[PDB]
Short mmCIF file of all heavy atoms in Angstrom, two decimals:
data_model
loop_
_atom_site.label_atom_id
_atom_site.label_comp_id
_atom_site.label_asym_id
_atom_site.label_seq_id
_atom_site.Cartn_x
_atom_site.Cartn_y
_atom_site.Cartn_z
N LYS A 9 -51.73 -30.93 -76.91
CA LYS A 9 -52.13 -32.30 -77.23
C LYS A 9 -52.25 -32.26 -78.73
O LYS A 9 -52.91 -31.41 -79.29
CB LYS A 9 -53.53 -32.57 -76.61
CG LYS A 9 -54.02 -34.01 -76.88
CD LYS A 9 -55.41 -34.23 -76.36
CE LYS A 9 -55.52 -33.97 -74.88
NZ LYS A 9 -56.85 -34.38 -74.28
N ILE A 10 -51.55 -33.15 -79.40
CA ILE A 10 -51.58 -33.19 -80.83
C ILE A 10 -52.85 -33.94 -81.27
O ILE A 10 -53.41 -33.70 -82.34
CB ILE A 10 -50.34 -33.92 -81.41
CG1 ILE A 10 -49.12 -33.07 -81.23
CG2 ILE A 10 -50.58 -34.27 -82.87
CD1 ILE A 10 -47.84 -33.68 -81.70
N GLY A 11 -53.29 -34.87 -80.41
CA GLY A 11 -54.47 -35.63 -80.71
C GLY A 11 -54.41 -37.01 -80.08
O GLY A 11 -53.65 -37.21 -79.11
N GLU A 12 -55.18 -37.97 -80.61
CA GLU A 12 -55.16 -39.29 -80.06
C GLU A 12 -54.71 -40.33 -81.06
O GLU A 12 -55.33 -40.53 -82.11
CB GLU A 12 -56.59 -39.60 -79.54
CG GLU A 12 -57.01 -38.61 -78.46
CD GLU A 12 -58.29 -38.98 -77.76
OE1 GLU A 12 -59.36 -38.93 -78.42
OE2 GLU A 12 -58.26 -39.29 -76.57
N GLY A 13 -53.65 -41.04 -80.75
CA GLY A 13 -53.11 -42.04 -81.64
C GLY A 13 -53.71 -43.40 -81.42
O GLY A 13 -54.62 -43.60 -80.65
N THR A 14 -53.15 -44.36 -82.14
CA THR A 14 -53.59 -45.75 -82.02
C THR A 14 -53.41 -46.24 -80.60
O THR A 14 -54.33 -46.83 -80.03
CB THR A 14 -52.73 -46.69 -82.92
OG1 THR A 14 -52.78 -46.25 -84.29
CG2 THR A 14 -53.22 -48.12 -82.82
N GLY A 16 -52.55 -44.25 -77.77
CA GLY A 16 -52.77 -43.31 -76.68
C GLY A 16 -52.62 -41.87 -77.13
O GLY A 16 -52.40 -41.62 -78.33
N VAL A 17 -52.73 -40.93 -76.18
CA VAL A 17 -52.61 -39.52 -76.50
C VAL A 17 -51.19 -39.20 -76.96
O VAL A 17 -50.23 -39.82 -76.51
CB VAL A 17 -52.95 -38.67 -75.28
CG1 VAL A 17 -52.97 -37.19 -75.67
CG2 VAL A 17 -54.30 -39.07 -74.73
N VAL A 18 -51.08 -38.24 -77.87
CA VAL A 18 -49.78 -37.82 -78.40
C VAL A 18 -49.68 -36.31 -78.12
O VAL A 18 -50.59 -35.57 -78.40
CB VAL A 18 -49.69 -38.03 -79.95
CG1 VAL A 18 -48.33 -37.56 -80.43
CG2 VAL A 18 -49.93 -39.47 -80.28
N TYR A 19 -48.58 -35.88 -77.54
CA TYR A 19 -48.42 -34.45 -77.30
C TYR A 19 -47.20 -33.89 -77.98
O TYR A 19 -46.27 -34.60 -78.34
CB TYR A 19 -48.19 -34.19 -75.80
CG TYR A 19 -49.14 -34.88 -74.83
CD1 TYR A 19 -48.76 -36.08 -74.25
CD2 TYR A 19 -50.34 -34.32 -74.46
CE1 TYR A 19 -49.58 -36.72 -73.27
CE2 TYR A 19 -51.21 -34.95 -73.53
CZ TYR A 19 -50.79 -36.13 -72.96
OH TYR A 19 -51.58 -36.75 -72.01
N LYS A 20 -47.22 -32.56 -78.15
CA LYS A 20 -46.06 -31.86 -78.71
C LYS A 20 -45.49 -31.43 -77.38
O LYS A 20 -46.15 -30.82 -76.54
CB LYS A 20 -46.51 -30.66 -79.52
CG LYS A 20 -45.37 -29.83 -80.08
CD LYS A 20 -45.87 -28.68 -80.95
CE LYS A 20 -44.66 -27.94 -81.53
NZ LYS A 20 -45.05 -26.82 -82.40
N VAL A 30 -40.50 -32.24 -79.44
CA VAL A 30 -40.76 -33.62 -79.86
C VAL A 30 -42.25 -33.99 -79.85
O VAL A 30 -43.08 -33.20 -79.40
CB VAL A 30 -40.02 -34.63 -78.97
CG1 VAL A 30 -38.49 -34.37 -79.03
CG2 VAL A 30 -40.45 -34.45 -77.51
N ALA A 31 -42.52 -35.20 -80.35
CA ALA A 31 -43.84 -35.77 -80.34
C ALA A 31 -43.78 -36.84 -79.21
O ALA A 31 -43.06 -37.80 -79.40
CB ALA A 31 -44.17 -36.38 -81.68
N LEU A 32 -44.53 -36.67 -78.16
CA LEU A 32 -44.45 -37.64 -77.10
C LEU A 32 -45.71 -38.49 -77.05
O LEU A 32 -46.83 -37.96 -76.89
CB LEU A 32 -44.27 -36.88 -75.74
CG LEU A 32 -44.14 -37.69 -74.47
CD1 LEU A 32 -42.99 -38.69 -74.58
CD2 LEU A 32 -43.92 -36.75 -73.34
N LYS A 33 -45.56 -39.77 -77.26
CA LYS A 33 -46.71 -40.66 -77.29
C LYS A 33 -46.81 -41.54 -76.07
O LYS A 33 -45.86 -42.26 -75.70
CB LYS A 33 -46.62 -41.52 -78.55
CG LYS A 33 -46.25 -40.74 -79.81
CD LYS A 33 -46.42 -41.56 -81.10
CE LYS A 33 -46.23 -40.72 -82.34
NZ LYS A 33 -46.70 -41.40 -83.58
N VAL A 60 -39.68 -41.52 -89.46
CA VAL A 60 -39.70 -40.66 -88.30
C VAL A 60 -38.81 -41.25 -87.19
O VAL A 60 -39.00 -42.41 -86.75
CB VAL A 60 -41.13 -40.48 -87.71
CG1 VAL A 60 -41.09 -39.59 -86.49
CG2 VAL A 60 -42.03 -39.82 -88.79
N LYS A 61 -37.81 -40.51 -86.74
CA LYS A 61 -36.89 -41.07 -85.77
C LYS A 61 -37.53 -41.28 -84.39
O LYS A 61 -38.17 -40.38 -83.83
CB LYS A 61 -35.63 -40.19 -85.63
CG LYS A 61 -34.54 -40.87 -84.75
CD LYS A 61 -33.95 -42.11 -85.41
CE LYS A 61 -32.81 -42.69 -84.58
NZ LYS A 61 -32.11 -43.80 -85.27
N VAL A 75 -40.78 -41.26 -77.52
CA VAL A 75 -40.39 -39.91 -77.92
C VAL A 75 -39.96 -39.94 -79.38
O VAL A 75 -38.98 -40.64 -79.73
CB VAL A 75 -39.18 -39.39 -77.09
CG1 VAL A 75 -38.85 -37.95 -77.48
CG2 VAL A 75 -39.49 -39.48 -75.59
N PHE A 76 -40.66 -39.17 -80.22
CA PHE A 76 -40.36 -39.13 -81.66
C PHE A 76 -39.94 -37.75 -82.12
O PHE A 76 -40.33 -36.77 -81.57
CB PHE A 76 -41.65 -39.50 -82.39
CG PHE A 76 -41.95 -40.97 -82.38
CD1 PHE A 76 -42.84 -41.51 -81.47
CD2 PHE A 76 -41.40 -41.81 -83.38
CE1 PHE A 76 -43.16 -42.87 -81.48
CE2 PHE A 76 -41.73 -43.19 -83.38
CZ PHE A 76 -42.60 -43.69 -82.46
N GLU A 77 -39.10 -37.69 -83.20
CA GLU A 77 -38.72 -36.37 -83.72
C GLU A 77 -40.03 -35.75 -84.16
O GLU A 77 -40.95 -36.45 -84.59
CB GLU A 77 -37.79 -36.51 -84.95
CG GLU A 77 -38.43 -37.10 -86.15
CD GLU A 77 -37.59 -36.99 -87.44
OE1 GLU A 77 -37.36 -35.85 -87.85
OE2 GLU A 77 -37.26 -38.04 -87.98
N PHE A 78 -40.12 -34.46 -84.02
CA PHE A 78 -41.37 -33.77 -84.33
C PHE A 78 -41.38 -33.28 -85.78
O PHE A 78 -40.38 -32.72 -86.27
CB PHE A 78 -41.55 -32.60 -83.37
CG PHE A 78 -42.77 -31.75 -83.59
CD1 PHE A 78 -44.01 -32.13 -82.99
CD2 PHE A 78 -42.75 -30.66 -84.44
CE1 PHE A 78 -45.15 -31.36 -83.26
CE2 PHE A 78 -43.87 -29.91 -84.71
CZ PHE A 78 -45.05 -30.27 -84.12
N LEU A 79 -42.48 -33.50 -86.47
CA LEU A 79 -42.57 -32.97 -87.83
C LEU A 79 -43.66 -32.01 -87.93
O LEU A 79 -44.61 -31.99 -87.16
CB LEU A 79 -42.69 -34.16 -88.87
CG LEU A 79 -41.34 -34.64 -89.33
CD1 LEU A 79 -40.97 -35.93 -88.64
CD2 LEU A 79 -41.30 -34.81 -90.86
N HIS A 80 -43.53 -31.18 -88.97
CA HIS A 80 -44.37 -30.06 -89.29
C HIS A 80 -45.88 -30.29 -89.52
O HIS A 80 -46.73 -29.59 -88.92
CB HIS A 80 -43.79 -29.37 -90.53
CG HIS A 80 -42.28 -29.15 -90.42
ND1 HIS A 80 -41.58 -28.52 -91.39
CD2 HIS A 80 -41.39 -29.48 -89.48
CE1 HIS A 80 -40.29 -28.44 -91.06
NE2 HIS A 80 -40.14 -29.03 -89.86
N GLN A 81 -46.26 -31.23 -90.38
CA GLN A 81 -47.68 -31.44 -90.70
C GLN A 81 -47.90 -32.87 -91.13
O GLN A 81 -46.89 -33.57 -91.46
CB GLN A 81 -48.03 -30.50 -91.85
CG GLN A 81 -49.49 -30.53 -92.34
CD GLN A 81 -49.83 -29.23 -93.06
OE1 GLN A 81 -49.63 -28.19 -92.49
NE2 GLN A 81 -50.28 -29.34 -94.28
N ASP A 82 -49.13 -33.39 -91.09
CA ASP A 82 -49.39 -34.75 -91.54
C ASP A 82 -50.03 -34.71 -92.92
O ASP A 82 -50.54 -33.69 -93.37
CB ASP A 82 -50.23 -35.55 -90.54
CG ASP A 82 -51.65 -35.03 -90.42
OD1 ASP A 82 -52.45 -35.07 -91.38
OD2 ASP A 82 -52.06 -34.61 -89.31
N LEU A 83 -49.91 -35.81 -93.64
CA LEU A 83 -50.40 -35.90 -95.03
C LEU A 83 -51.92 -35.67 -95.10
O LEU A 83 -52.42 -35.08 -96.09
CB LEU A 83 -50.07 -37.23 -95.66
CG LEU A 83 -50.44 -37.34 -97.13
CD1 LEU A 83 -49.64 -36.35 -97.94
CD2 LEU A 83 -50.17 -38.79 -97.62
N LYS A 85 -53.86 -33.67 -93.21
CA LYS A 85 -54.14 -32.24 -93.16
C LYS A 85 -53.65 -31.55 -94.44
O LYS A 85 -54.27 -30.58 -94.93
CB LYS A 85 -53.48 -31.61 -91.95
CG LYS A 85 -53.81 -30.13 -91.83
CD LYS A 85 -53.02 -29.44 -90.68
CE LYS A 85 -53.50 -28.04 -90.51
NZ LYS A 85 -53.40 -27.28 -91.79
N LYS A 125 -51.41 -44.94 -92.95
CA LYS A 125 -52.55 -44.08 -93.24
C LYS A 125 -52.06 -42.68 -93.32
O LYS A 125 -51.01 -42.34 -92.79
CB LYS A 125 -53.69 -44.25 -92.20
CG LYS A 125 -53.31 -43.89 -90.79
CD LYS A 125 -54.24 -44.64 -89.81
CE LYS A 125 -53.88 -44.40 -88.36
NZ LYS A 125 -54.63 -45.30 -87.47
N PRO A 126 -52.81 -41.79 -94.02
CA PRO A 126 -52.40 -40.39 -94.15
C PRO A 126 -52.04 -39.71 -92.82
O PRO A 126 -51.09 -38.86 -92.82
CB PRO A 126 -53.60 -39.76 -94.85
CG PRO A 126 -54.15 -40.90 -95.72
CD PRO A 126 -54.04 -42.09 -94.78
N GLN A 127 -52.70 -40.04 -91.76
CA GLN A 127 -52.45 -39.48 -90.44
C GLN A 127 -51.07 -39.81 -89.93
O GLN A 127 -50.49 -39.00 -89.16
CB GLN A 127 -53.53 -39.99 -89.46
CG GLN A 127 -53.66 -39.27 -88.14
CD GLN A 127 -54.83 -39.81 -87.29
OE1 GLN A 127 -54.90 -41.02 -87.07
NE2 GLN A 127 -55.73 -38.95 -86.94
N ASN A 128 -50.44 -40.95 -90.26
CA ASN A 128 -49.10 -41.19 -89.77
C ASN A 128 -47.97 -41.00 -90.80
O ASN A 128 -46.87 -41.54 -90.60
CB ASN A 128 -48.97 -42.59 -89.09
CG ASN A 128 -49.35 -43.74 -89.93
OD1 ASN A 128 -49.11 -43.78 -91.16
ND2 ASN A 128 -49.98 -44.75 -89.28
N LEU A 129 -48.24 -40.32 -91.92
CA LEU A 129 -47.26 -39.95 -92.89
C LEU A 129 -47.02 -38.45 -92.63
O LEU A 129 -47.97 -37.65 -92.76
CB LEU A 129 -47.79 -40.14 -94.32
CG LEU A 129 -48.12 -41.62 -94.65
CD1 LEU A 129 -48.56 -41.76 -96.14
CD2 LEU A 129 -46.90 -42.43 -94.38
N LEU A 130 -45.80 -38.07 -92.27
CA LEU A 130 -45.51 -36.71 -91.92
C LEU A 130 -44.60 -35.98 -92.91
O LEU A 130 -43.61 -36.53 -93.39
CB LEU A 130 -44.89 -36.70 -90.54
CG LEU A 130 -45.66 -37.58 -89.56
CD1 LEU A 130 -45.04 -37.44 -88.18
CD2 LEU A 130 -47.14 -37.15 -89.54
N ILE A 131 -44.89 -34.71 -93.13
CA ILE A 131 -44.08 -33.93 -94.07
C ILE A 131 -43.44 -32.71 -93.45
O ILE A 131 -43.90 -32.23 -92.40
CB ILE A 131 -44.94 -33.45 -95.28
CG1 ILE A 131 -45.95 -32.45 -94.85
CG2 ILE A 131 -45.63 -34.67 -95.91
CD1 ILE A 131 -46.79 -31.88 -95.96
N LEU A 139 -42.52 -41.84 -92.64
CA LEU A 139 -43.44 -42.75 -92.05
C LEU A 139 -43.26 -42.83 -90.54
O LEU A 139 -42.16 -43.01 -90.06
CB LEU A 139 -43.25 -44.15 -92.66
CG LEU A 139 -43.46 -44.20 -94.15
CD1 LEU A 139 -42.21 -44.71 -94.86
CD2 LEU A 139 -44.64 -45.14 -94.47
N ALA A 140 -44.37 -42.64 -89.82
CA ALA A 140 -44.30 -42.70 -88.36
C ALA A 140 -44.98 -43.98 -87.90
O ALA A 140 -45.98 -44.44 -88.51
CB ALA A 140 -45.00 -41.52 -87.76
N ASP A 141 -44.41 -44.60 -86.86
CA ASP A 141 -44.93 -45.82 -86.18
C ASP A 141 -44.61 -47.18 -86.75
O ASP A 141 -45.31 -48.16 -86.47
CB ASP A 141 -46.40 -45.68 -85.95
CG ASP A 141 -46.74 -44.56 -84.95
OD1 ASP A 141 -45.79 -44.04 -84.36
OD2 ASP A 141 -47.94 -44.24 -84.78
N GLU A 158 -62.55 -44.75 -80.12
CA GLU A 158 -62.24 -43.90 -81.29
C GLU A 158 -62.16 -44.79 -82.51
O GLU A 158 -61.29 -45.63 -82.70
CB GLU A 158 -60.88 -43.22 -81.04
CG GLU A 158 -60.94 -42.12 -80.01
CD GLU A 158 -59.59 -41.80 -79.49
OE1 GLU A 158 -58.65 -41.61 -80.28
OE2 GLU A 158 -59.39 -41.74 -78.22
C1 LIG B 301 -48.83 -33.06 -87.38
C2 LIG B 301 -48.15 -32.24 -86.39
C3 LIG B 301 -47.66 -32.79 -85.22
N1 LIG B 301 -46.29 -33.33 -85.46
C4 LIG B 301 -46.09 -34.66 -85.32
N2 LIG B 301 -44.86 -35.15 -85.26
C5 LIG B 301 -44.82 -36.50 -85.09
N3 LIG B 301 -43.71 -37.20 -85.07
C6 LIG B 301 -46.16 -37.04 -85.08
C7 LIG B 301 -46.51 -38.39 -84.95
O1 LIG B 301 -45.58 -39.32 -84.88
C8 LIG B 301 -47.97 -38.82 -84.94
C9 LIG B 301 -48.39 -39.83 -85.82
C10 LIG B 301 -49.76 -40.22 -85.83
C11 LIG B 301 -50.73 -39.61 -84.98
C12 LIG B 301 -52.09 -40.03 -84.99
C13 LIG B 301 -53.04 -39.38 -84.18
C14 LIG B 301 -52.64 -38.34 -83.29
C15 LIG B 301 -51.26 -37.93 -83.24
C16 LIG B 301 -50.29 -38.57 -84.07
C17 LIG B 301 -48.94 -38.18 -84.05
S1 LIG B 301 -47.33 -35.81 -85.15
#
Side-chain angles (χ1 to χ4, degrees):
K9 180 184 302 188
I10 288 176
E12 302 187 291
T14 302
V17 186
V18 181
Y19 313 95
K20 178 175 183 180
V30 299
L32 182 57
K33 315 191 172 192
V60 177
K61 189 67 177 187
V75 184
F76 283 96
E77 67 169 298
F78 178 89
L79 269 103
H80 315 182
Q81 183 158 304
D82 67 64
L83 187 64
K85 182 185 188 305
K125 60 205 177 188
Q127 195 176 55
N128 56 39
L129 296 184
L130 313 184
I131 67 179
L139 299 122
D141 296 350
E158 288 161 49

